[PDB]
């Protein structure tokens, strides 16, 4: 599909078993999901943009579907406004800018 950007770029993806509504954000290095008790062994991390860092849990090797196209990856799970895809899944998919 070919996305606009005339509003914010929502889109569903499935994470866990859970569908949830997160934002394509090529400014993202790394995936940044809500609260999710997802298991695994994490390792804790601080990410960061305006304002400061926030504390997550890393989790690697998460299976996330989006807009059904599979990707596996790293997420990492703590408190956002909104659920944010990186380019770290972004480019699994194929996932250009064009203009």
Same mark, same amino acid.
């Given at each position: 599909? @070919?996305?606009?950007?005339?509003? =914010? *770029?929502?889109? #569903?993806? =499935? !994470? /866990?078993? @859970?569908?949830?509504?997160?934002?394509?954000? #090529? /400014?993202?290095?790394?995936? $940044? !999901?809500?609260?999710?008790?997802? *298991?695994?062994?994490?390792?804790? %991390?601080?990410?960061?943009?305006?304002?400061?860092? !926030? %504390? $997550? =849990? @890393?989790?690697? @090797?998460? *299976?996330?579907?989006?807009? /059904?196209?599979?990707?596996?990856?790293?997420?990492? $799970? /703590?408190? #956002?406004? $909104?659920? !944010?895809?990186? =380019?770290?899944?972004?480019?699994?998919?194929?996932?250009?800018?064009?203009?």
């Amino acid at each position: 599909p @070919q996305i606009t950007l005339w509003k =914010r *770029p929502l889109v #569903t993806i =499935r !994470i /866990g078993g @859970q569908l949830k509504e997160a934002l394509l954000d #090529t /400014g993202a290095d790394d995936t $940044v !999901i809500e609260e999710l008790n997802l *298991p695994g062994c994490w390792k804790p %991390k601080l990410i960061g943009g305006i304002a400061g860092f !926030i %504390k $997550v =849990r @890393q989790y690697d @090797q998460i *299976p996330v579907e989006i807009a /059904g196209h599979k990707a596996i990856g790293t997420v990492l $799970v /703590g408190p #956002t406004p $909104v659920n !944010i895809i990186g =380019r770290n899944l972004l480019t699994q998919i194929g996932a250009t800018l064009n203009f």
